Design a protein around this ligand. Structure first.
Ligand SMILES: CNc1cnn(C)c(=O)c1Cl
Length: 127
């Protein structure tokens, strides 16, 4: 079984804007998570072929990862901050759905989610 194509990261047919919250999601949220000791498994799409996990994309129909989110933010793919927050939420939920609770990857995802929630609880004000 092949990997699926990665999620779309640009689209010239959508209007674009810079906002306080979107800037914060890249400059603070993404950048801070990216530096975490346990960020590496979440920095790019899950390579189910190399991991020999052909059931990964049988189970996970909405893949998401921080590499994709980073590109989306850089490419102004999101109009609303919540679209980006939803992508982070999806990334964590995918990990929890697919993996066994005792797996290191879940411990890692949970550590990142803790940091994520700390950062989004300090989201700046909307225009
Ligand atoms: C490299 N990241 C991985 C690898 N395997 N699985 C099952 C995952 O959920 C993740 Cl995030």
């Amino acid at each position: 079984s092949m990997n699926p194509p990665p999620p779309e990261t640009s689209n010239p047919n959508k209007p674009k804007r810079q906002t306080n919250q979107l800037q914060y999601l890249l400059r603070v949220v993404l950048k801070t998570l990216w530096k975490h000791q346990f960020a590496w498994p979440f920095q790019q799409p899950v390579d189910a072929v190399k991991l020999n996990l052909p059931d990964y994309y049988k189970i996970i129909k909405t893949p998401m990862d921080m590499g994709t989110i980073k590109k989306r933010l850089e490419n102004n793919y999101y109009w609303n901050a919540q679209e980006c927050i939803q992508d982070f939420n999806t990334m964590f939920t995918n990990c929890y759905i697919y993996n066994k609770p005792g797996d290191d990857i879940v411990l890692m995802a949970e550590a990142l989610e803790k940091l994520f929630l700390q950062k989004i609880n300090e989201l700046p004000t909307e225009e």
